Amino acid sequence: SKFLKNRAVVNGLPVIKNPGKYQHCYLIEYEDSTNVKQTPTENKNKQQQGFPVYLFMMNPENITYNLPINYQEIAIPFTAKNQLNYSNGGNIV
Amino acid sequence: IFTSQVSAYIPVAPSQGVGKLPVYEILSY
């Protein structure tokens, strides 16, 4: 689809360099997202050691992101359209 | 949404002088 793709938007996206090895995703405790492995081997007695909570053996084949935005409907009689009132944004699943 | 509740209603529509006095004393001054 490289003949129909909008070149205007593609050229504005950042270019990413291919890394060295096959990367595996993981789950890490939050506020540990910026630490780097203070020790060679996990010491659970201490905290903020920068070790993943769970290491994926195999990367996911696909990842789905869902975001509903909470708007509210007000049905006023004898109106061609309902009133939509913004309620909130919602969490990404 | 802001909701309003209004409770309203309709009001219904539409002698010369006294007799006797105690005796006085008058003193010119």
Composition of chain B by helix, strand, coil, percent to 5: 0, 0, 100
Q: Which of A92, A91, A93, A72 is nearest to A83 (CA)?
A: A72
Distance between start and end Cα atoms, chain B:
88
CA–CA distances in Å: residue B3 to residues A69, A81, B13: 22, 18, 31
Pure H helices in chain A: 7-11
Distance, in Å, from the CA atom of A19 to the CA atom of B9, rounded to the nearest integer, reads: 76
Q: Do A42 and A49 touch, CB atoms closer than 8 A?
A: yes
Q: Locate the chain B residue with the closest alpha carbon to A86.
A: B1
Q: How far is residue B21 from each of residues A57, B13, B18, B28, measured CA to CA in Å?
A: 122, 51, 8, 21
Q: Which residue of A has its CA nearest to B3?
A: A74
Question: What's the distance, CA A75 to chain centroid?
Answer: 35
Q: Please report, in angstroms and rounded to a whole number, the separation of the first and last CA atoms in chain A.
A: 29
Closest-CA distance of chain B to residue A57, Å? 48
Length reported for chain B: 29
Residue whose token pair is 């903020």: A48
Instruction: Name the experiment that determined this structure.
Output: cryo-EM
- Resolution (angstroms) stands at 3.4
**Rounded distance between C-alpha atoms, residue B4 and residue A74, angstroms:** 13
Let me know: does A38 contact A50? Beta carbons within 8 Å: yes
Stretch 49-78 of chain A: residues touching chain B, C-beta under 8 Å: 72, 74
On whether any CB of chain A is under 8 Å from the CB of B1, the answer is: yes
Give the residue on A whose Cα is nearest the Cα of B1: A85
